[PDB]
């Protein structure tokens, strides 16, 4: 499962029908002048796939329409076409298309041209592994800083939720509510089997009263009704077995609640050390559990580790990013969107992040932007955004155009 | 630890019940064996994350609720059929 193609129309700067050339299953990198509409390109994808765009007030919906110049736009859509070869989307198609259309008072999703609800789209992506509990299928500078400058309690809340504490408690509560509702259906079921048994007793003894010598149909089908009743019983017994299996399951899940969470934390921390040592060769990083109350970071770019508070600029950014990478490697995803995650990094550290994407892109798709040429080295296919008449366009370029453009562009930092 | 198997395996229909039960059919619900489903959750090949077990729990309970729904419907229809055959 990866993003095979994107089509945008009327969305922010993308006034005209922009049929983006189909992405490589590996690393796609987008370059272009500052303010030419690159971040708009990621917003268009997040508009379809990201849950933070799922609820849009009518004023928010309208602010996504193109208001660039002439005939002010009244409708927009974005379409993701997924490759579904590994059948990760529960849809028996090789290609799945997901379009969201907005207008003055329209906000409609379409799955292979058929209308579906927002919950459908959420459940569709949840069952493909895209957890609303994981905020890092898209990474921007906003997220890296939010991580780097977060209270240790916030780090804890985030890792708890990714481990699944909120999901679990929510599914546990909905399950209970379902069990008790089912518990009423089981009683009504046993009532009806008692009533049926009643009539089988009435029937049998009218049947006997006539043999010494009520429609004949009931008497004709007496053995049929008795056979049917046992088929119902066997299914009723299947429910009783299932009730017992559920009780065990609920009990066992509750009893492994913490060692589950503790195993997700031990994994993220183990990954945080591995990710960082690979980005800063000859460095040491690790998570720390506090007063639980919080989760902190300790790191040494050198044997004496300092904290996140007293850390440099483009080092706090690199460490935070290294943590995000660790959580990602711990709850992986088929494709990733990086909007200028190399922005605050030294040339050396951008080169290391580039080297990491090189290997990751062997097993997941990446769609990234940058204004610095390190990440261009790890790329497989190149796109340039051009902006003229307040209208964004996007076109495939060669690697040399991408490297040349990035080198002597002056528009960024 | 989180997305085990890409599904179409043993817990496949459970995972589907947990997310998009719209696409879960009466044939699925009937042929789902709740006790071997629970068995492969309480002791899987790889330990699975609290998030994954939480979904699957709802998967199992949702299929179980649909079995009851059908059994109830069928019992009401069998009881009506007998009352009708009397007349």
Swiss-Prot record, chain A:
Pfam family, one: SMC_N
Residue positions, PTM N6-acetyllysine: 105-106, 140, 386
Lineage: superkingdom: Eukaryota
Binding site for ATP: 32-39
Post-translational modification, as annotated: Ubiquitinated by the DCX(DCAF15) complex, leading to its degradation. Acetylation at Lys-105 and Lys-106 by ESCO1 is important for genome stability and S phase sister chromatid cohesion. Regulated by DSCC1, it is required for processive DNA synthesis, coupling sister chromatid cohesion establishment during S phase to DNA replication. Deacetylation by HDAC8, regulates release of the cohesin complex from chromatin.
Compartments it resides in: Nucleus; Chromosome; Chromosome, Centromere
SUPFAM superfamilies according to UniProt: P-loop containing nucleoside triphosphate hydrolases (SSF52540), Smc hinge domain (SSF75553)
Outcome recorded upon mutating residue 106 to R: Stabilizes interaction with PDS5A and WAPL
InterPro entries the record matches: P-loop_NTPase (IPR027417), RecF/RecN/SMC_N (IPR003395), SMC (IPR024704), SMC3_ABC_euk (IPR041741), SMC_hinge (IPR010935), SMC_hinge_sf (IPR036277)
Modified residues (Phosphoserine): 245
Transmembrane segments annotated in the record for this chain: none
Domains (record comment): The flexible SMC hinge domain, which separates the large intramolecular coiled coil regions, allows the heterotypic interaction with the corresponding domain of SMC1A or SMC1B, forming a V-shaped heterodimer. The two heads of the heterodimer are then connected by different ends of the cleavable RAD21 protein, forming a ring structure.
Family of the protein in this entry: Belongs to the SMC family. SMC3 subfamily.
Reported function: Central component of cohesin, a complex required for chromosome cohesion during the cell cycle. The cohesin complex may form a large proteinaceous ring within which sister chromatids can be trapped. At anaphase, the complex is cleaved and dissociates from chromatin, allowing sister chromatids to segregate. Cohesion is coupled to DNA replication and is involved in DNA repair. The cohesin complex also plays an important role in spindle pole assembly during mitosis and in chromosomes movement.
Note: Mutated Cornelia de Lange cell lines display genomic instability and sensitivity to ionizing radiation and interstrand cross-linking agents.
Subunit structure: Forms a heterodimer with SMC1A or SMC1B in cohesin complexes. Cohesin complexes are composed of the SMC1 (SMC1A or SMC1B) and SMC3 heterodimer attached via their SMC hinge domain, RAD21 which link them, and one STAG protein (STAG1, STAG2 or STAG3), which interacts with RAD21. Also found in meiosis-specific cohesin complexes. Found in a complex with SMC1A, CDCA5 and RAD21, PDS5A/SCC-112 and PDS5B/APRIN. Interacts with NUMA1, and forms a ternary complex with KIF3B and KIFAP3, suggesting a function in tethering the chromosomes to the spindle pole and in chromosome movement.
PANTHER family: STRUCTURAL MAINTENANCE OF CHROMOSOMES PROTEIN 3
Protein name: Structural maintenance of chromosomes protein 3
Organism encoding this protein: Homo sapiens
GN (gene name): SMC3
UniProtKB/Swiss-Prot annotation, chain B:
Tissue: Expressed in the gut (at protein level).
PTMs per UniProt: Cleaved by separase/ESPL1 at the onset of anaphase; this cleavage is required for sister chromatid separation and cytokinesis. Cleaved by caspase-3/CASP3 or caspase-7/CASP7 at the beginning of apoptosis.
Covalent link (Glycyl lysine isopeptide (Lys-Gly) (interchain with G-Cter in SUMO2)) residue numbers: 45
Phosphoserine: residues carrying this PTM: 43
Source taxon at top rank: Eukaryota
Record's subunit section: Component of the cohesin complex, which consists of an SMC1A/B and SMC3 heterodimer core and 2 non-Smc subunits RAD21 and STAG1/SA1, STAG2/SA2 or STAG3/SA3. Interacts (via C-terminus) with SMC1A and (via N-terminus) with SMC3; these interactions are direct. The cohesin complex interacts with NUMA1. The cohesin complex also interacts with CDCA5, PDS5A and PDS5B; this interaction might regulate the ability of the cohesin complex to mediate sister chromatid cohesion. The interaction with PDS5B is direct and is stimulated by STAG1/SA1.
Linked pathology: Cornelia de Lange syndrome 4 with or without midline brain defects: A form of Cornelia de Lange syndrome, a clinically heterogeneous developmental disorder associated with malformations affecting multiple systems. It is characterized by facial dysmorphisms, abnormal hands and feet, growth delay, cognitive retardation, hirsutism, gastroesophageal dysfunction and cardiac, ophthalmologic and genitourinary anomalies. Mungan syndrome: An autosomal recessive disease characterized by visceral neuromyopathy, intestinal dysmotility and chronic intestinal pseudoobstruction, megaduodenum, long-segment Barrett esophagus, and a variety of cardiac valve or septal defects such as membranous ventricular septal defect, pulmonary and tricuspid valve regurgitation.
Domain notes: The C-terminal part associates with the ATPase head of SMC1A, while the N-terminal part binds to the ATPase head of SMC3.
Family according to the record: Belongs to the rad21 family.
Name assigned to this protein: Double-strand-break repair protein rad21 homolog
Shown part of the complete sequence: 4 to 90 of 631
């Amino acid at each position: 499962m990866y993003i095979k193609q994107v089509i945008i129309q009327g969305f922010r700067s993308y006034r005209d029908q922009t049929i983006v050339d189909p992405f490589s299953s590996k690393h796609n990198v987008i370059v272009g002048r500052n303010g030419s509409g690159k971040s708009n390109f990621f917003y268009a994808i997040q508009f379809v796939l990201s849950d933070e765009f799922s609820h849009l007030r009518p004023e928010q919906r309208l602010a996504l329409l193109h208001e660039g110049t002439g005939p002010r736009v009244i409708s927009a859509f974005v379409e993701i076409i997924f490759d579904n070869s590994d059948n990760r989307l529960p849809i028996d198609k090789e290609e799945v298309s997901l379009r969201r259309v907005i207008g003055a008072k329209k906000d409609q999703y379409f799955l292979d041209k058929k209308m579906v609800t927002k919950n459908d789209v959420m459940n569709l992506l949840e069952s493909a592994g895209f957890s609303r509990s994981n905020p890092y299928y898209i990474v921007k500078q906003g997220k890296i800083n939010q991580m780097a400058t977060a209270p240790d309690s916030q780090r804890l809340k985030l890792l708890r939720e990714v481990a699944g504490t909120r999901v679990y408690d929510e599914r546990k509560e909905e399950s209970i509510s379902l069990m008790k509702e089912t518990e009423g259906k089981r009683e009504k079921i046993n009532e009806l089997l008692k009533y049926i048994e009643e009539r089988l007793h009435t029937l049998e003894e009218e049947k006997e009263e006539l043999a010494q010598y009520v429609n004949k149909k009931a008497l004709d089908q007496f053995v049929n009704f008795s056979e049917q009743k046992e088929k119902l019983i066997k299914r009723q017994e299947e429910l009783d077995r299932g009730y017992k299996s559920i009780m065990e399951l609920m009990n066992v899940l509750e009893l492994r609640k913490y060692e589950a969470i503790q195993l997700t934390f031990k994994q993220v921390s183990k990954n945080f050390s591995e990710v960082f040592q690979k980005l800063v060769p000859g460095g040491k990083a690790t998570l720390v559990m506090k007063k639980f109350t919080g989760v902190g970071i300790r790191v040494s770019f050198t044997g004496e580790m300092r904290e996140m508070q007293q850390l440099s600029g483009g080092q706090k950014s690199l460490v935070a990013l290294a943590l995000i990478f660790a959580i990602q490697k711990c709850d992986p995803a088929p494709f990733y969107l990086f909007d200028q995650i190399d922005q605050a990094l030294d040339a050396q550290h951008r080169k290391a992040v580039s080297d990491m994407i090189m290997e990751l892109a062997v097993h997941a798709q990446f769609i990234t932007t940058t204004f610095r040429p390190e990440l261009l080295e790890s790329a497989d296919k190149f796109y340039g955004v051009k902006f003229r008449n307040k209208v964004s366009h996007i076109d495939v370029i060669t690697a040399e155009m991408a490297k040349d453009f990035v080198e002597d562009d002056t528009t960024h930092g | 630890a989180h997305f085990v198997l890409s599904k179409r395996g043993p817990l496949a229909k459970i995972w589907l019940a947990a997310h998009w039960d719209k696409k879960l059919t009466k044939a699925h619900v009937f042929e789902c064996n709740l006790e071997s489903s629970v068995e492969s959750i309480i002791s899987p090949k790889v330990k699975m994350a609290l998030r994954t077990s939480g979904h699957l729990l709802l998967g199992v309970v949702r299929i179980y609720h649909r079995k009851a729904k059908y059994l109830l419907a069928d019992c009401n229809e069998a009881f009506i059929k007998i009352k009708m055959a009397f007349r």
